[PDB]
Amino acid sequence: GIVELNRQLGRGVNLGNALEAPWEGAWGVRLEEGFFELIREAGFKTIRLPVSWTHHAGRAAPYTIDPAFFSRVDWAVTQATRRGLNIVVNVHHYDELNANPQAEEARYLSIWRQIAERYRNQPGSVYFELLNEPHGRFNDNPQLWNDLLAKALRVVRESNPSRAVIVGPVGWNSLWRLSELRLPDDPNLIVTFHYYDPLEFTHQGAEWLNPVPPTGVVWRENQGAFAAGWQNWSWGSRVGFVGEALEITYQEGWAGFYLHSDAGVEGYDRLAFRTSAPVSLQVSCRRDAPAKAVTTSGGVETVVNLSECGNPSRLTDLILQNNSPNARAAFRLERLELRGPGSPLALLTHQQNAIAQAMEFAQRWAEQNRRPIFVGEFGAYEKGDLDSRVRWTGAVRSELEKRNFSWAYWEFAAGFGIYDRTTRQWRTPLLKALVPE
Ligand SMILES: OC[C@H]1O[C@@H](O)[C@H](O)[C@@H](O)[C@@H]1O
């Protein structure tokens, strides 16, 4: 059973900044035989092996992969199997494929044919991952990635008829894109996504972004936040999480509190909200649609049916607009949630329940499509304070294992690593946030 394989994945870690670089050690990490034993001792069961093959394969057909690089990957797989561990071999970075899928398709398929035919006789502890974090042109048209992964799975199944293949959506394997993912009817598929929300914390001070985001961002389970997948598009207003509620200062006429979700939600019929003071508002759940005028009163809930403010089939935009030509004094939005025949959705929450909501969306998609879930990457950069990193990592791990998700932390050493190669010591708070045995 594919579910049994995905459960045998369990807990794992990434050997990052290694083989996914232009060459091994180019990004700081060279693979050593002792890392596998350390990972086996720490309590993990799986090792995800980021490998970028585009640097070690011919540019012209038949696009042969360099045999020495193949020997390196064979050494990695053998060290993983010798220590009772699973190993996920993937196609990681591939800028030529993401920038031009049509032209690079033949080379990608030949690379995957070589990889599959080489490891066709490996036991069930060896997993395949077609493409890590598809982006670029795959974001422009996820059907390109759907067709390409269909072709790649065809190629793989030509020699591996029942090996677990790990497939993910576009948008850098964002779960908020699972809705656009289309898989064939193959029984042995494992859906994957990478969780790095919020990006303001997990990637703070990441020198490879442009803009490199500010540093010193704190993360706590009580730190106020919006619902997962909802961005703040408010215009002309000071919107800020002060305490457990949300302070809103309408700074000009017809300014509005705006929450946008690229993914969207379905199955909700009315929106409920409560403010600290009486405010006049225009409520809009559909942009370019008739908003509804509602007058508030302090400490008093207000529920407006979505049918009377836009009536959207898929709720993507939500606007509480200052129904006034002038500015207004600051107030506190203390509640904001959507309700329907099923469970509600708290749009105001903390980072903890935001992680919870993200995992709930992922689990709903997984159950409706009947696919096991393996979170391939999650972690916080070292530029954040260690306490916040430990709290975030523990929260994500707990909410992943609540949803029966197999996961692979990012990463083992260096940047997001849990092992300090300099001191030869485990970063114990992070390790216990991962494995509290
Ligand atoms: O140098 C560190 C490297 O980290 C990786 O995770 C990024 O994808 C690269 O863009 C970067 O160069």
Author numbering: 17 to 453
Paper quotes:
Here, by solving the crystal structure, it is shown that MtGlu5 from Meiothermus taiwanensis WR-220, a GH5-family endo-β-1,4-glucanase (EC 3.2.1.4), has a bipartite architecture consisting of a Cel5A-like catalytic domain with a (β/α)8 TIM-barrel fold and an inserted CBM29-like noncatalytic domain with a β-jelly-roll fold. MtGlu5 contains a Cel5A-like CD similar to TmCel5A from Thermotoga maritima, but has an additional novel domain inserted into an internal site in the CD. Unlike other known cellulases with CBMs at the termini, this inserted CBM in the newly identified MtGlu5 acts in synergy with the CD, as demonstrated by ITC experiments.
Subsequently, sugar-bound crystals of wild-type MtGlu5 were obtained by substrate co-crystallization with carboxy­methyl cellulose (CMC). However, it turned out to contain only one protein molecule in the asymmetric unit, with a high solvent content of ∼70%. In the refined model of MtGlu5, the conserved CD has a (β/α)8 TIM-barrel fold and the inserted CBM shows a β-jelly-roll fold. In the catalytic pocket, the glucose molecule is sandwiched between the indole side chains of Trp43 and Trp224, which are presumably engaged in stacking interactions. The binding site is adjacent to the two conserved catalytic residues Glu149 and Glu393. It corresponds to the −2 or −3 sugar of a bound cellulose substrate, according to the general nomenclature. The other sugar units were not observed because they were considered to be leaving products and were not properly retained in the active site.
